[PDB]
Amino acid sequence: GHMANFDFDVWRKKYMRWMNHKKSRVMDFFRRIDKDQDGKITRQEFIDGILASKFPTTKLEMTAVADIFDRDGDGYIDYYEFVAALHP
């Protein structure tokens, strides 16, 4: 039930610098995680995806970022939310 101002600009910059330096495109990541190919991934599928890529981050951080990605709060991170979060 707790909420905080999470430094998402720093997590985001850190993530994009990581991907860009690791020869990966974030949409290959999304499409890879989106197995049903309908343009959605659960907050949990997304978190598990990031942690699985072994990007330096923690579960405590990832509940926060997954919260921020899910801009509507319907439990799913869709394609447009994903892009909007990473590419304002």
Among 19, 33, 63, 76, binds a copy of itself (CB under 8 A): 63
- Cβ atoms of 18 and 55 closer than 8 Å: yes
- Of residues 9-68, those binding Zn ion (CB under 5 A): 9
Q: Does 88 bind another protein (CB under 8 A)?
A: yes
Give the nearer residue to Zn ion in terms of CB position, either 9 or 36: 9
Is 38 flagged in the annotation as binding? yes
Q: Does 34 bind Ca ion (CB under 5 A)?
A: yes
CB burial readout 38-49, b (16+ within 10 A) else e: eebbebebbbbb
CA atoms within 13 A on the CB side of 83: 8
Q: For residue 35, how far is the Cα from the chain centroid?
A: 16
Find tokens 């197995």 and name the residue.
35
The residues binding Ca ion (CB under 5 A) are 34, 36, 38, 40, 70, 72, 74, 76
Instruction: Give me the residues that bind another protein (CB under 8 A), please.
Output: 1-5, 8, 71-73, 88
Footprint on this chain of Zn ion (rule: CB under 5 A): 9
